[PDB]
Amino acid sequence: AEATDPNGYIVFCPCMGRFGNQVDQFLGVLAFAKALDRTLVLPNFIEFKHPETKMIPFEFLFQVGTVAKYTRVVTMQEFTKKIMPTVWPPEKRKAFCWTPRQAIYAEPGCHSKEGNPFGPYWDQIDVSFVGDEYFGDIPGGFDLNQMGSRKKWLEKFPSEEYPVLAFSSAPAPFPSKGKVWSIQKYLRWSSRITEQAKKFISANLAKPFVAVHLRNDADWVRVCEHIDTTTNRPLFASEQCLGEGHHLGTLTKEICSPSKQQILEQIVEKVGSIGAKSVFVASDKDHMIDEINEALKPYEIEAHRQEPDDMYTSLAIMGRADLFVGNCVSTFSHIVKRERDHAGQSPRPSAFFGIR
Amino acid sequence: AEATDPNGYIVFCPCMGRFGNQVDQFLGVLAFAKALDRTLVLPNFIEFKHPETKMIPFEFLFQVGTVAKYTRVVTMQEFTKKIMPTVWPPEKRKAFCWTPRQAIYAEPGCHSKEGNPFGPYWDQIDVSFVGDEYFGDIPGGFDLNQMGSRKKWLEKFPSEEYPVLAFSSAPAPFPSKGKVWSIQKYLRWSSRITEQAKKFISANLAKPFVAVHLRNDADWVRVCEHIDTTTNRPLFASEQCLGEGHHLGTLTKEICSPSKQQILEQIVEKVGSIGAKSVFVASDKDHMIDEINEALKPYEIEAHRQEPDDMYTSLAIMGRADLFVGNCVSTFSHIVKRERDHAGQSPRPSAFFGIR
Numbered sequence: 001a002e003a004t005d006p007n008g009y010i011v012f013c014p015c016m017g018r019f020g021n022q023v024d025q026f027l028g029v030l031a032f033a034k035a036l037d038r039t040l041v042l043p044n045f046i047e048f049k050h051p052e053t054k055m056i057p058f059e060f061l062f063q064v065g066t067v068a069k070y071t072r073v074v075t076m077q078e079f080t081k082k083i084m085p086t087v088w089p090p091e092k093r094k095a096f097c098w099t100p101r102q103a104i105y106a107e108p109g110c111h112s113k114e115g116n117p118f119g120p121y122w123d124q125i126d127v128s129f130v131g132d133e134y135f136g137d138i139p140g141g142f143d144l145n146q147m148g149s150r151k152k153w154l155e156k157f158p159s160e161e162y163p164v165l166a167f168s169s170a171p172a173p174f175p176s177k178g179k180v181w182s183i184q185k186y187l188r189w190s191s192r193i194t195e196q197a198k199k200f201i202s203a204n205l206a207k208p209f210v211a212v213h214l215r216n217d218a219d220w221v222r223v224c225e226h227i228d229t230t231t232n233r234p235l236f237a238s239e240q241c242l243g244e245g246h247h248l249g250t251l252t253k254e255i256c257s258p259s260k261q262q263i264l265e266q267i268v269e270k271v272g273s274i275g276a277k278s279v280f281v282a283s284d285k286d287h288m289i290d291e292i293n294e295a296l297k298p299y300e301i302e303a304h305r306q307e308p309d310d311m312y313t314s315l316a317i318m319g320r321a322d323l324f325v326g327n328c329v330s331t332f333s334h335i336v337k338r339e340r341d342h343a344g345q346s347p348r349p350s351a352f353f354g355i356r
Numbered sequence: 357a358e359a360t361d362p363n364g365y366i367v368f369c370p371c372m373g374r375f376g377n378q379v380d381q382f383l384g385v386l387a388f389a390k391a392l393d394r395t396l397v398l399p400n401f402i403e404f405k406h407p408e409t410k411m412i413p414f415e416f417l418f419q420v421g422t423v424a425k426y427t428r429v430v431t432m433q434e435f436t437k438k439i440m441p442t443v444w445p446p447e448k449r450k451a452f453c454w455t456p457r458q459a460i461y462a463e464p465g466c467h468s469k470e471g472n473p474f475g476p477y478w479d480q481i482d483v484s485f486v487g488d489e490y491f492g493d494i495p496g497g498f499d500l501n502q503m504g505s506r507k508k509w510l511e512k513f514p515s516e517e518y519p520v521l522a523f524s525s526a527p528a529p530f531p532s533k534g535k536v537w538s539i540q541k542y543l544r545w546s547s548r549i550t551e552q553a554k555k556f557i558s559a560n561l562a563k564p565f566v567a568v569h570l571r572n573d574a575d576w577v578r579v580c581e582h583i584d585t586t587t588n589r590p591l592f593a594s595e596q597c598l599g600e601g602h603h604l605g606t607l608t609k610e611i612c613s614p615s616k617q618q619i620l621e622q623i624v625e626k627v628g629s630i631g632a633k634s635v636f637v638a639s640d641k642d643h644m645i646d647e648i649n650e651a652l653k654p655y656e657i658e659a660h661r662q663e664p665d666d667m668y669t670s671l672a673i674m675g676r677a678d679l680f681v682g683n684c685v686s687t688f689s690h691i692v693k694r695e696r697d698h699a700g701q702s703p704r705p706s707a708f709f710g711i712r
């Protein structure tokens with residue numbers, strides 16, 4: 001690709017949060033790239049592994065062919081090898097953020113490589129920045145939500161001088177707007193992940209199966225404990241079950257953090273509802289395999305988990321489930337819901353804990 | 357003050373940079389508070405002292421009476437004691453920033469108390485935040501530069517629900533826009549600082565005197581070394597000598613970082629130009645007292661510095677000088693220029709190194 005895009009490129013660090021947060025932003029980055037009509041450089045996703053920061057190529061997890069059906073993309077590999085040499089030489093590498101900020105960890109700026117995963121991400125692809133540009137004065141920043149905003153991007157950063165818009169963090173709302181959720185149709189698991197999910201299913205999961213997502217780490221309970229039921233504002237992915245602006249009801253700590261009793265009761269019920277012959281559990285911590293097996297011991301079915309627990313293949317398995325029960329607050333669960341809603345010709349059944 | 361402002365308050369951390377950066381932003385914060393018609397809580401200015409972060413009350417450095425002639429203000433002391441108890445109880449304390457960000461040093465947010473001086477600043481006045489609000493979707497953020505922007509602030513954050521807009525960093529452009537520079541008229545040194553400046557002057561500085569600002573730390577030379585004379589964009593305070601958008605000429609490393617020879621030559625010349633009987637030197641590091649004294653040894657005058665070097669009183673002394681020669685890039689020098697331009701009925705003479 002020595003003939004490059006006359007419109008230029010967007011590259012970004014999915015520098016906020018873990019895989020759920022990253023995917024939730026990436027959907028908005030797709031819609032932003034599409035609107036600007038610049039080619040999107042597909043990110044390396046980030047996985048934290050005490051004390052390694054691991055960059056995972058887009059194409060290891062998801063298929064490029066499929067995402068290309070939404071908008072014009074190149075892989076990070078393509079970008080660094082075929083594109084960067086001729087359109088983005090070291091002296092043109094500027095980072096983009098809302099406003100200059102004070103370094104924590106020295107001239108005011110974006111500080112795109114301060115801290116983790118910020119520095120490792122750009123180090124991975126040999127990028128250092130020589131300057132910062134700011135987009136705060138464009139109405140709504142990267143939203144493209146207000147009149148003149150797209151024009152302003154095009155006016156202020158035209159591709160001739162700015163062939164690459166390089167963003168310190170994903171230029172997208174978090175949590176994602178309802179209007180980007182259907183874009184998850186264009187995220188299809190790689191052959192590797194699908195093979196592994198199918199293998200696990202044939203080896204462990206008598207059909208039909210219920211897949212459940214259990215989010216229960218100490219840090220999660222503590223954010224759930226902060227729910228203000230009177231103000232009732234969105235929290236992370238909560239609009240996935242409660243609708244936009246929470247117009248369907250009230251978010252409670254029972255929804256955010258279902259009790260062990262609530263979980264078992266609901267799992268027992270869902271198993272009965274479809275005549276399930278197995279249960280799959282994905283969790284950040286406690287899979288509750290024993291508690292669930294005791295609860296399902298009457299039905300003569302069992303719960304199964306991945307050993308060790310591969311988050312990406314767990315996501316794939318849950319997307320394949322006959323029935324999925326998720327956590328409505330979690331953006332991890334939200335990946336599953338969007339895939340089940342949008343991946344095929346018709347919605348695959350999904351439920352959430354604490355909601356009926 | 358148990359009868360509080362129906363329009364509400366703005367409080368902020370001058371969380372970016374040292375005293376120059378802080379004052380340069382504070383001018384814009386004044387204009388922003390004035391435009392919104394909310395009472396401004398005067399900050400504690402921040403001084404870093406390996407390893408103490410020191411908060412200095414506004415009123416120790418500058419006079420409240422004078423700043424009150426620009427817009428409605430209360431001191432931090434007033435705020436915490438008379439205002440906060442009735443209008444801003446712990447459960448209403450929300451921080452305001454452009455957009456949610458990833459913590460470096462855990463839910464996405466403003467992270468208003470992560471790091472130094474961020475945490476110490478709010479700890480000083482016993483504030484913890486229970487929530488974040490974002491203003492990125494208001495066109496130009498805090499600029500008030502675009503149509504509907506002020507209305508949007510008033511619409512989105514009306515004083516009833518939001519009696520206090522508390523900003524993680526100063527809601528103002530950096531570097532400051534030309535249109536806020538005259539606001540420096542309303543920053544008058546406290547009695548303490550003026551007494552000390554007058555004492556030093558009577559004890560050491562035979563009139564008329566030339567005051568010079570010498571900025572020459574290792575970190576400063578290194579930013580100067582980055583000047584792109586072909587693109588010629590503003591750098592920190594450079595528009596103070598080169599006009600807005602650098603329409604008067606080109607910024608060079610000679611202006612940014614005058615050589616030792618350039619400094620002496622120019623000082624010798626300025627001394628001759630007004631028949632100076634002494635020289636005052638303020639510097640971040642090397643005062644060059646010996647080099648200057650050798651250069652002035654023919655004229656039978658000497659250079660004097662403060663021992664130890666009080667930045668605030670040095671600023672006051674330079675504002676009082678018969679002639680001031682500054683560094684055009686430095687926001688520290690810019691405080692002096694603005695004061696000399698605006699404090700009295702008529703401009704007091706100022707020059708910059710490398711420009712004539």
Ligand SMILES: C[C@@H]1O[C@H](OP(=O)(O)OP(=O)(O)OC[C@H]2O[C@@H](n3cnc4c(=O)[nH]c(N)nc43)[C@H](O)[C@@H]2O)[C@@H](O)[C@H](O)[C@@H]1O
Nearest residue numbers: 017018019020021282283284309310311330331332462463
């Ligand atoms: C507290 C908030 O939580 C939000 O988390 P939430 O939406 O659940 O979704 P994530 O952003 O993915 O954060 C949850 C992370 O925890 C691990 N995790 C959660 N569930 C599973 C699982 O079933 N299997 C495996 N292997 N790992 C799991 C995984 O690394 C995942 O990316 C964040 O997005 C916000 O940034 C914030 O931190």
Ligand SMILES: C[C@@H]1O[C@H](OP(=O)(O)OP(=O)(O)OC[C@H]2O[C@@H](n3cnc4c(=O)[nH]c(N)nc43)[C@H](O)[C@@H]2O)[C@@H](O)[C@H](O)[C@@H]1O
Nearest residue numbers: 106107373374375376377638639640665666667686687688
């Ligand atoms: C590199 C950039 O430099 C910019 O500095 P610049 O405009 O000179 O102005 P300041 O933001 O004040 O940073 C310079 C600081 O260094 C010390 N300093 C400089 N001159 C003197 C002096 O004459 N006497 C004393 N006692 N101290 C001095 C002082 O603490 C002052 O606040 C920053 O605003 C930016 O944030 C960035 O760091």
